């Protein structure tokens, strides 16, 4: 088995299932799904962080925002709900009246996700499972239901993997002052031994009740509890060698790193497994202020996925359900778009490896990404070239054979110097959906 | 803002208001104010500590004393209240039937205090505010009132500063064995992680509910919680840059040090800000056994204040209210005496700085202290010289002009060698109250 | 006495002399002074750290830059001294043949400086005193003289305070790899126990041999050695209470913070003592490529010191001598011009204290800086207004008597709304040198 | 870049070259090589550690054994070289007079090895390069040559990867007492800060001078020095990303684990990269007492590498040269015979990946090992079956096309229940050398 120590734990590497999966669905859903409001400011890495927390665009940050008097959220709250209306009161409004866990899993499977990961407890501390350590949970308040357990049964019956998300680093149930600046995160935390034990008993409890395939932590782990993870990790891996943990614990071990919006995004091959995450929009929690203006489009979603996958990453796309349990139409439609693209092109994505390089481009600026599957080399164009002549630069091949993916029709090419030249018969170019895809066998 | 680390926190120095204030009132008041008894043994630093805890003179130490069987307090307790009468039972007798927070603040303002600091929780653990972490408090038991909050409103409306005192180091609600010797203090403490969290949540709670101008800790801070103060201090200073903390935390940071009775008393200029504290008597908590025999006299109080102020210190004089909320007459009278002296001489005290030296003396043994205010040099005699000729030794001046303070009447003087000689016309000497005061302008 | 522990060293605050000194001279002089060359790229806070170490503008980093093959420095070194000319070999050309310490102290005295601080060992590890802990020092090689010692006697003869600079964080005598990006500094350090002892002993020796007025460390203190500093600070302070240390050690204690070029400048009053430091030009070490285009002007220097001084700081101006011990005239002439404005306006600068605010400006944008001296408030215009009606935006006065500093001639003024209006007669405005200075006495 | 901290170094995984190399040659050569003698007791994992150090079979432990008076080694030393012949004196007889590095690299190349790792300093502390940190090295004494350096050029000339072995945990130059029982290793170590610095500097120097492909430490890293490794690993990886480190340092990071003789052998697939290591005979250093009785046979070596390789490992085979630089023929002939089986079957070994399982066996017990190469699955019988009907217990195939590896001749096969049956024609079975190899393509 694994021993409770970093050297021993190193022995555990990211399981094959996670590496080969490529696409998963995040689900930020909770009492913050009720007010369902946030000022759609922009993308992390582009919105200046000295204003960021005051015009927070992440609707799940509502309580933090409500705690900063006179901030869009505060005014919005008083006008819609009134002053005498505490945030925790939303736990009782959080009823999931129309939630159908199996409809959800059906949806994610059509969409092409191979795993799903719901928030089991976000920064506000509300727990979506019947935990035995707090009464602020979905069984006692709102839904009157074990949201986490019921969803795991569904996802697993649909044959997808199930992981859990937990805010180890922050819990507003243990603080008062809101975060106004990045620097605040350094001292405005539970900070107590009591909180460290709590966090521990809670992740241990999710492991014992659901044995998730992934432990997805957020915001670091209570400094007083970091040494606990040696035991927790050994405990978890000895009951499920194929489980996995991300890199937001702040300790020596992780199975795969993470990148969020612009933040930590690799430009070329990293050399370790990682996962990119972002909302279909700018917020993770449902934001009734967002319109298509702020959401990506099926095509941008497909481009996001290829770019991520060509770089050894997995894309963990967030969906933001409504308080009643339904997934807003603007997001259900996009998941479907992606789902379809994956039905046609999935074999150039699932189960692939990175190639010598991730990227290239045509003489005329269309970007290209590559992926590998043994001797097969998928060439994925981020769009569809109009001309039949395609000149890819700074690229030479030693294959001899280059087929047009969806049809398998052998194509002619030749290395014209520093470039590679292929002729794609418009009959074939019109056959492709959002990306021209060529397969090359060396 | 301030970062949660000792290097960063160093950036914070004692605020000007505390430095310039010079005089403040401590208030040790609680259920121990009910039995209101202690054997008046003497002054800390003079009573041998191998007997000290057995004949404890600090009435607030009653529970500790009651826990040492057959000790004056134990016999006194059984005879007055009986064996079957636990100390905690005094929480219910602690009724403050005649407390008027505003009368108190009026009193302290007449007295000349520029700030006030009540015990919010002493060694016995009873809390004088409606804390949400223990039911042993003034809201649930005794007074049925938030003693701390109500007093803060008063003091602040009287225009004085408000700080809080808290026994971080000791809490008899978490121990059983009493302290019999100094050495016991090294292991007879709560000692638990639970206690450390508790102390933390409680000071954090006073900060959030009242934002005190001073955090006055006592008896050190729970070893398991010392690292918490980085966050607590940064948290506190970022909400109130003008707050301040004393030196009884046992960590790298403090704004001003403290000296208690004989213990740690500086003999000449220290070079850092500090504050002296002591009771009008020998005990801090009300002791119905003390008589004028054991209390200082308005004159000794004035001398204590000048000596302290000439050495860069602030004097924090303790008042010991009665269980019903009234301040015993022997103490109200002395506060008033001091108050008056300050109305006449206050300008040679408030807002001053130390001079090249703090002290001197006449040929005939009257001690002298100095204080500064720009080029003005206050010369304060600890008494009133009978003769018109005054020979101050080991002192020469380069001023040229030396006025008699309360009148401003220019006086003649000359440096007669190693000494300084001034002639104070008896008309002027009789005009002064407890101290002859000369002003010199160089 | 001071004890070897942070709580105790907290007691020591910035000595009065330092706070009142206002202006010191840094001297970066070493064997790097001989090639005396850098590509003059810019101001720290302005050049991208992405190419910084490659196009380094700080001539004292010659060795680092020379270790980066294909760097402008590497290019220059090979054509000028040859590929087989080791940096270390400069210690044999570093002969200080025309060096006259009394001449430097006199120049720094005439320039208006109150303390002088020379590099005793910069990053290259060459020591400008006969340390017994290495033979790569100015006694065994180059000058065959104790530069620190000799200049220490001269500065003191000239009546100025003498401090010492020491590269504790970097010593290239213990590394081989050059620094290429900021990240590198995290791991390209000496790292050994050996080196932590070397730094300790070397500063201890500087303290025993010359008991400096200031211990100015750079680049941090070796992690394995940080605790030694409790002992070193206590040792130093107990031998010399009035000494001081800067903030570049990476431990809880320091007396005054520092700010370099654009990096860390206070926008307004800070609350602690600090010191701005910069070259007269961009480099600290002599750079033959810098011409007047790259240097500040007497005007700009004065404006600098006034700004820095009105915000509570000290200005540590850097001079960079030539390999032969001579001070380049461009630098000597700027130091002299500053000296003149100070002989003339010293009183509005030395021994001053910040006022309620540091800053203000005229209707037509002339900037204005303030300083205090008891009741006397100096008003310094960064330059001399042409008109006679002068309008100061956002500033009333409760003084009644505004005089013209250099003549003492009373002037007419009144509060015109949120503004202050004063009439300075052009005969007076023509007398002022670089700055119109008004003196008010509220 | 990599940063000096475990979370960051986690990023670095075993380089592809190492994983694909499959076979390397260890070289234990030093001044112990001159007495070249040990009592040949057995295999680690077989000899009782109760007498192990007393009857030591590892000739490179000569000094330790010689310090145990009344040990077979002590006996032999006195009769052979005399009581007054200090171990250290062997450095003068260690002359490598017939040493030809290109000759070794060529032999290791012909033997089929892809990397070579020599002992740069074993437990006796003698260094086989001109380290500047001790005079007990091969430049000042014995060979008067830089053995590490010279062999490093040859191995690379021969096109092989070169790593370095370093005894970080033990250095007998810092102890006097010998090791007598396993327990002793817990306290008979250098122990000093001094030594932790020595090890750091020495490996740093090996990294600067030869940037090895592998840092293979032995016996742990000095406790006082364990943290230096964050800095050393980052430094090494940043200079050479494709380098690697083994698991004998006692800190969180490592790229591949090790297994020695019986100690730690994986029974089946492990999940991480590892490397088995052993002598061709029992000793690592040359032992004149070992004859063929104590060595493995070409047959056994091949069987070893196949087993080790099918379980995901690499086999690090040890060669032990003579004091004069010559490789004993018994060892040279085994290396050559292995080389031949590899020239012939390399393809089923190099660049391979574990299959679903490593193992299987025939009805009549012939063991069978598997390896993968994309879809191609190599089946290796440890030996050549006599019959033609071959029955493989517990193994179905879903391939359809099983060919005979050395001829490519298609063969007949079908699934007979929980078994697989194949018919290998004796003309083919007669062509195979030590192992019948079948290649399947499902």
TrEMBL record, chains A, B, C, D:
The cross-references to Pfam families, in alphabetical order and at most eight, read: Alpha_L_fucos
Can you say what this protein is called?
alpha-L-fucosidase
Q: Where is the Glycoside hydrolase family 29 N-terminal domain?
A: 1-347
Its GO biological process annotations read: fucose metabolic process; glycoside catabolic process
Among Gene3D superfamilies, the record links this protein to:
Glycosidases, Golgi alpha-mannosidase II
List the disulfide bonds in this chain.
Answer: 358-359
- General function of this protein: Alpha-L-fucosidase is responsible for hydrolyzing the alpha-1,6-linked fucose joined to the reducing-end N-acetylglucosamine of the carbohydrate moieties of glycoproteins.
The record's annotation in InterPro entries points to: FUC_metazoa-typ, GH, Glyco_hydro_29, Glyco_hydro_29_N, Glyco_hydro_b
Task: Report the SUPFAM superfamilies cross-referenced here.
Answer: (Trans)glycosidases, Glycosyl hydrolase domain
Record-level GO cellular component terms: lysosome
Q: What is its EC number?
A: 3.2.1.51
Which SMART domains does the UniProt entry name for this protein?
Alpha_L_fucos
Q: Keywords for this entry? A: Glycosidase, Hydrolase, Signal
Q: Which residues get modified to N6-carboxylysine?
A: 332
User: In which family does this protein belong, per the annotation?
Assistant: Belongs to the glycosyl hydrolase 29 family.
- Organism, as annotated: Thermotoga maritima (strain ATCC 43589 / DSM 3109 / JCM 10099 / NBRC 100826 / MSB8)
Domain of life of the organism encoding this protein: Bacteria
Q: Which GO MF terms are attached to this record? A: alpha-L-fucosidase activity
First-level EC class: hydrolase
